[PDB]
Structure 1
Amino acid sequence: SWKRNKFRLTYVAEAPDLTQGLSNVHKKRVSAARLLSRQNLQSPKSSRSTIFVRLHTNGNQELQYQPGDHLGVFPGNHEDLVNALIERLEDAPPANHVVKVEMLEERNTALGVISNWKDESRLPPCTIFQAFKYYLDITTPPTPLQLQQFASLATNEKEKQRLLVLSKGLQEYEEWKWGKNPTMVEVLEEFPSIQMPATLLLTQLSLLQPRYYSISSSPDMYPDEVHLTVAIVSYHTRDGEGPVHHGVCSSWLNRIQADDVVPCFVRGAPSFHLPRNPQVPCILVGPGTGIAPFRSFWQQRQFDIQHKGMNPCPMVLVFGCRQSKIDHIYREETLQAKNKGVFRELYTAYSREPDRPKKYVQDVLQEQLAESVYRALKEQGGHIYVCGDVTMAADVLKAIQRIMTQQGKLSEEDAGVFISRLRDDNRYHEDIFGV
């Protein structure tokens, strides 16, 4: 918690570089990758965007990965936002000097009570600008409790009262939060009478979390590179008259220039790797950006075939998107992979195709691949991988359970048990893109 005269900023001469600071803060080895290129994957006439990102690992062995793994990425908040926030600070040193945070530690029933300054040691030594851009979350709306604290900092009665109403965290708060999705700087601007101490924000804001992305490349096909498939998150606030808010990491990845440092790390996904046995059938289900890990899969299989002399069992891809002319990302690539024997068949379920009835990936599974799915999973030691949206994944599970009841001639209960065992045996895989 925070209180006046509890924290102070102190100038210091030494400071680690970004990747070291992040490593120290998050207690894990963060590495420095480089942006090689970025390309838009959807049609320019699309209302949305998905970008293809190519990163170079600088030959750093700590960034070794296998198809199916994830890459945690640390983005930077937008500078205009960082600058605007610093401008609303009450006692902020120029934001270009390296400082550390010290906290007045007081002790107990020690009869007189003894205070002692010492390093808080949350953030590493850095400038205020660097702290707000690379280490802290300045975008997540403040909690009712934070607004309560903000109320005691407002010098305008009317504003204090409003803040106090919101601090109740009920109807008024929900309306405010859900309608405005206010960033920290936005709150200070709505209530300009708030006297915001730099130390409060520097110690109370949460740490900026890394964002995970399913690696979209095979390490053999692209040595020293890591590819990502990123949906661009952008949204209108206040029903339309409010400003447009952009996802922090996706917008950052959409802004960086070639050579810019991208702090990241690999997080292995032991339960989302291709099978050790190349001869069993695999069915890949990944609509939209959910196709991401499967790009690493088809590149690896293509490489294994053409360079390792392997003859793996051809896989099946079940993709889905809105329209053939808008968001059918990686279309030509999957086509070429099929031509080289990686895939036996490709399927695409279009949901908003002009003059075409809506189709979801689960529809393809049930209407065109029911017997195939059943034979692969039950009789051929096969695997099924599902990647993407959480609701889609849940719906696909249901479709597979239905296939098991019909094709397998099982009761609801036993179909569920079978699927549960598939998960346990690591033959049913899920890569869900959670919030």
Structure 2
Amino acid sequence: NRDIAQVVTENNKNYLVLYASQTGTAEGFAKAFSKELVAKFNLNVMCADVENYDFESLNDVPVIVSIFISTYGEGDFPDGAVNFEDFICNAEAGALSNLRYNMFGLGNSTYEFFNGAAKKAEKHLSAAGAIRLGKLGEADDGAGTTDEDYMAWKDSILEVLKDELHLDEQEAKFTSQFQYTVLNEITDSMSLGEPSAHYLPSHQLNRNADGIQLGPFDLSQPYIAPIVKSRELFSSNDRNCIHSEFDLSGSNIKYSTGDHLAVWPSNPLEKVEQFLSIFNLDPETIFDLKPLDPTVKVPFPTPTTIGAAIKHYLEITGPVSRQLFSSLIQFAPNADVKEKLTLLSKDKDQFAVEITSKYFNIADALKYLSDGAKWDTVPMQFLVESVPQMTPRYYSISSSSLSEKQTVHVTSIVENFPNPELPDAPPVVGVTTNLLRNIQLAQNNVNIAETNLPVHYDLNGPRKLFANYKLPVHVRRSNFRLPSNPSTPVIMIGPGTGVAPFRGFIRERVAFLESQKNVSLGKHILFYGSRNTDDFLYQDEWPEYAKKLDGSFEMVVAHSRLPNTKKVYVQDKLKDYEDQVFEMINNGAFIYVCGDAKGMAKGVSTALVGILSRGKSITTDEATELIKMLKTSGRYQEDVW
């Protein structure tokens, strides 16, 4: 049931594919690998998420095992796989003597401890007597080769397994893991986009005395919340950054300052049409899925309608995998298209040249190859099993839980830029952020027709559940936390939207200090950065905070795109203030680093190592050593995405 060795064996599984994924990138790969393993060798594969089983009986698995693992924080596994991680990292010598395995790890050489989770896992497994088949995969998200790195690894590993298991190959064909059935009418027990089953009429939400919706909210059960206040934070005519405030009072959701909110999106309507159209699918088509065996888990709530699945369940937007092309060879519209497809599916460069570079979505790519010709010979089941599941997007809460107990503010820079290849094509946009903007404009009664909103969304949702600008959401507890003692000095470094956590930190300290109106607040310094003065987040708030925190606060701003001047980064300002900074560090100061800006984590860490190197007059190595210590002792925290 939860005993891995037992489940494999009880379902006569030939192969075991395991995956530890947060954002669901490994999940998707693991699944692709399984489908190909079944298409080519007919093997009865089990594709399990390492968080739904108890690997104590791992050494009793009579089948070869593939492990897809991602990396987060210090080279470590993704929360929600901590169990799996512990089993593996606390495995004694000769504890996995029977385990034959191969693994593909996902990473980003932009971080330190690049793919350190897969690396760590591999180090323990071998040591626990487990033999590794084929090369250790290593996807580099930083270099944007993740998908190709897989393709490469995948092919080699398949030759490794063809041998080890003496498998006879066969032209690869699709084999649904479900029993696709087409219903005739919609019920209160059938979904139309509802986040989870609990929100279907036939089910009852679990409230309490005063109706407060209860239950634990997470990836399996969100909490539809109403954005009670929105506003634009920028003032540029190109970029946009929305500030959204969610009212969580209607539930029993508590959150700590420095946590994360996960927003569950819905595809933009213009993109939903495109998908439906190129495949010639009927939105209304009611269908249902029946797992063809115990280990198969239905992807979303069913029954449901095809349009409800393409608008709420599948990630119909994003980079097209070459492997997806290779999988569509079967269902190619005509012979000429079936041809172009076969070539692109094998030539890495051609695929990048004809597809990747143009920023195509699946719909677009397919339309491109077919010149409009519809792929009406593709089964919804294929799509359900071939298009990545939609996933929630995380945000760093910018509100303090001390002064906003049940209100969560979210600072979200909008992802919407012009296609660099096709000047005439629609901008490359991001689902969730442009969604939040739509709600920001709508809610604020702005003639959207005027604005530069690239797309729009169903703002009523499933059975008007999202009625009144509400979205599925849930809090993800983190370890980004202000020092226990208020007296402790604090150093916060966050460029762009990376200030979101610190807004809260500051609001938290400002709130606390007024809860005394005694306590002297240790020094707090925030190093902010942004292009110009149009993208200066909460510019008007900071001065107001400084009044209340007096000489306990200090903000240091760097701009990188001011006309007629040198480009300035926070790590530049750190060295300018290397004495104030070095002193604080010698005072038990805590160092917080948050933001995106690829290479900003390493850069900032490297500036600190230098501030330390110079300060204590030590080598650059000793200094990086001291910095690794701060990161282990929790004095140096990071929230870099």
TM-score (norm 2): 0.61
Aligned letter for 2:195? T
- Partner in structure 1 of residue 152 of structure 2: none
- Partner in structure 2 of residue 31 of structure 1: 223
Say if 1:19 and 1:311 are closer, same or farther in 2 by CA, change over 3 A.
farther
Q: Quick check: which one's strand share is greater?
A: 1
- Partner in structure 2 of residue 95 of structure 1: 283
- Partner in structure 2 of residue 113 of structure 1: none
CA distance in 1, matches of 2:505, 2:306: 43
Q: Do the aligned residues in 1 keep the contact of 2:527 with 2:573 (CA within 8 Å)?
A: yes
> How far apart are residue 344 of structure 1 and its match?
2.7
For structure 1, the residue ranges without an aligned partner over 5 or more in a row are 106-116
What secondary structure does 2:278 align onto? coil
Q: Do the aligned residues in 2 keep the contact of 1:77 with 1:248 (CA within 8 Å)?
A: yes
CA distance in 2, matches of 1:148, 1:119: 23
Aligned-residue sequence identity (percent) comes to: 27
- Partner in structure 2 of residue 40 of structure 1: 232
CA distance in 2, matches of 1:27, 1:385: 27
Match of 2:524 among 315, 335, 343: 315
What secondary structure does 1:386 align onto? strand
4+ residue stretches of structure 1 with deviation over 6 A?
Answer: 22-26
> How far apart are residue 169 of structure 1 and its match?
4.4
Match of 2:438 among 251, 255, 258: 255
Say if 1:360 and 1:142 are closer, same or farther in 2 by CA, change over 3 A.
closer
- Partner in structure 2 of residue 86 of structure 1: 276
Q: Do the aligned residues in 2 keep the contact of 1:314 with 1:341 (CA within 8 Å)?
A: no
CA distance in 1, matches of 2:329, 2:261: 40
Q: Do the aligned residues in 2 keep the contact of 1:102 with 1:119 (CA within 8 Å)?
A: no
What secondary structure does 1:385 align onto? strand
Aligned letter for 2:248? T
Q: Do the aligned residues in 1 keep the contact of 2:319 with 2:356 (CA within 8 Å)?
A: no
1:290 equivalent to 2:498? Answer yes
For structure 2, the residue ranges without an aligned partner over 5 or more in a row are 1-34, 36-173, 201-216, 444-467
- Partner in structure 1 of residue 171 of structure 2: none
Say if 1:6 and 1:303 are closer, same or farther in 2 by CA, change over 3 A.
closer
CA distance in 2, matches of 1:36, 1:65: 17
User: What's the CA shift string for 1:169-224, capped at 9, x where partnerless?
Assistant: 41101223331121122123222243322221122211111111000001232242
Match of 1:56 among 247, 250, 255: 247
> How far apart are residue 304 of structure 1 and its match?
0.3
Match of 2:426 among 234, 243, 246: 243
Q: Do the aligned residues in 1 keep the contact of 2:510 with 2:548 (CA within 8 Å)?
A: yes
Task: After TM superposition, list the pairs within 5 Å mapping 1:10-21 onto structure 2.
Answer: 10-11=182-183, 13=187, 14-15=189-190, 18-21=194-197
Say if 1:158 and 1:408 are closer, same or farther in 2 by CA, change over 3 A.
same
User: What's the CA shift string for 1:397-432, capped at 9, x where partnerless?
Assistant: 000000000011111111011000000110111110
1:406 equivalent to 2:614? Answer yes
What secondary structure does 2:492 align onto? strand
* Aligned residue-pair number: 414
Aligned letter for 1:20? S
Q: Do the aligned residues in 2 keep the contact of 1:9 with 1:199 (CA within 8 Å)?
A: no
Task: After TM superposition, list the pairs within 5 Å mapping 1:16-165 onto structure 2.
Answer: 18-21=194-197, 28-45=220-237, 47-62=238-253, 64-90=254-280, 92=281, 94-96=282-284, 98-102=286-290, 121-125=298-302, 126-165=304-343
Q: Do the aligned residues in 2 keep the contact of 1:73 with 1:211 (CA within 8 Å)?
A: yes
Match of 2:351 among 147, 164, 173: 173
Say if 1:120 and 1:287 are closer, same or farther in 2 by CA, change over 3 A.
closer
Cα root mean square deviation, aligned: 2.6
Task: After TM superposition, list the pairs within 5 Å mapping 1:380-419 onto structure 2.
Answer: 380-389=587-596, 390-419=598-627
- Partner in structure 1 of residue 406 of structure 2: 224
What secondary structure does 2:599 align onto? helix
Say if 1:128 and 1:155 are closer, same or farther in 2 by CA, change over 3 A.
closer
CA distance in 2, matches of 1:418, 1:145: 45
- Partner in structure 1 of residue 556 of structure 2: 347
Greater RCO (Cα-Cα under 8 Å, separation 6 or more): 1
> How far apart are residue 84 of structure 1 and its match?
2.8
CA distance in 2, matches of 1:26, 1:143: 29
CA distance in 2, matches of 1:427, 1:103: 48
What secondary structure does 2:181 align onto? strand
Aligned letter for 1:50? C
TM-score (norm 1): 0.88
Say if 1:44 and 1:323 are closer, same or farther in 2 by CA, change over 3 A.
closer
> How far apart are residue 355 of structure 1 and its match?
3.4
> How far apart are residue 253 of structure 1 and its match?
1.2
Aligned letter for 1:32? I
CA distance in 2, matches of 1:362, 1:4: 52
User: What's the CA shift string for 1:33-65, capped at 9, x where partnerless?
Assistant: 1112221111144x2111111111143123x11
User: What's the CA shift string for 1:377-405, capped at 9, x where partnerless?
Assistant: 1x211111111123112101000000000
